[PDB]
Symmetry: C2
Subunit: 211 residues, 2 copies
């Protein structure tokens, strides 16, 4: 009967936000369990590992019925196939995958700066402008003569890749609000994703986070 | 008949080895292009990016006919679906995927020690034993040793590759994990793999 859905993570966006964005977009009901809200995060996490048989002792963990799912990326791809926001072709699914992997390379770099105190200068002057150019270009290839007011990285429909790129820049802007000034398509794309009803309803009612 | 397959990367195993292992296992023909083997890796790489329109200016890059494919993990997943070495059921494909990302987590830590010379003891005493235990435990649950289903999946190759790369520096690693060891021994003896390895030229990373 579909069973109960529970997402386990710390009281942060981090590696669980994209999963939350997918649920919001699909309008899926689930319990957003966050360590630290009702109790001490450290103690909640330790107890959690004793109660649940996780494969790698890491979160996020997605529980569907009695099913325990680990590794955010795998969970994301699994949810995308099941709710069809993966791409109408094996080839378009590859492209969405490739872009998601790209989001990973640049996001990892942002994390090293915004969280682990790594030189922000290299990020702001070499990594951010460069990777933004890559996405702008990929967006340029699949637009204008493919879509109008709507912007998608793959095909003519929303894929988790659009959600991943939106999440990436939504996060980068909580630190550098002016990042997309020189990237029109990328800027219009994120504005577009942010205004989808289900997404808009989740963002505006989402609690602010540290990361 | 079909389209020429060309794999571009540096003269190393690194992020292209799993793909090469998949091609070997499948018995698929392709040109293994390696920067530096003939010309100068630096120069070849520079010329490469001018000749091919790559999405992120990084390699590996798999070229199939006119198609340009980037990002090693996306490539591995694409090839596995196209050649049916992915989890067959939706849930099994998820398990193969989850295990593969688990391999990336620990492979990432090996790279920081093996290549960017980070702390070698942290990896050896805290990371490696712990992760080998996770893999050993995943084998137990689903138990010819296979992580998912009763057939070979790219996850099996990913695990094999991980420990094969780790062993180039720490040989007696998985001595205390029988299942995991039998599993890698098993994969290494598959005719197509066994043959590919003995003919494979050694290299740092
Ligand atoms: C320096 C790394 C900072 C980690 C940022 C917070 S995320 C929480 C952390 N989880 C992961 O790193 C999961 C990685 C995994 N690849 C995924 O994407 O799901 C965890 O459970 N960690 C358990 C632990 O550390 O014991
Ligand atoms: C950090 C040095 C370690 C060397 C390892 C060799 S990997 C070569 C490197 N490629 C990547 O990092 C690709 C990452 C990508 N996420 C993938 O998995 O395909 C590249 O082309 N780099 C070109 C560049 O950065 O300009
Ligand atoms: O309530 C959410 C449903 O799963 C919908 O996305 C498809 O019917």
């Amino acid at each position: 009967m579909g069973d109960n859905i529970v997402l386990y993570y710390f009281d942060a966006r981090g590696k669980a936000e994209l999963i939350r964005l997918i649920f919001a977009y699909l309008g899926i009901e689930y319990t957003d369990k966050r360590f630290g809200v009702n109790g001490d995060a450290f103690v909640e996490f330790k107890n959690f590992k004793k109660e649940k048989d996780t494969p790698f002792e890491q979160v996020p963990i997605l529980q569907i019925g009695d099913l325990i799912l680990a590794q955010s990326q795998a969970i994301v791809r699994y949810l995308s196939k099941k709710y069809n926001i993966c791409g109408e072709s094996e080839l378009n699914e590859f492209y969405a995958d490739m872009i998601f992997c790209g989001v990973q390379d640049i996001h990892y770099k942002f994390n090293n700066t915004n969280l682990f105190k790594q030189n922000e200068t290299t990020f702001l002057n070499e990594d951010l402008p460069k990777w933004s150019g890559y996405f702008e270009k990929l967006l340029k290839k699949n637009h204008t003569n493919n879509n109008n007011d709507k912007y998608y990285f793959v095909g003519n429909n929303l894929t988790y890749a659009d959600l991943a790129v939106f999440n990436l820049y939504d996060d980068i802007e909580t630190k550098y609000p002016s990042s997309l000034k020189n990237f029109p398509l990328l800027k219009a794309h994120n504005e577009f994703i942010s205004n989808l009803p289900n997404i808009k309803n989740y963002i505006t009612n989402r609690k602010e986070s540290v990361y």
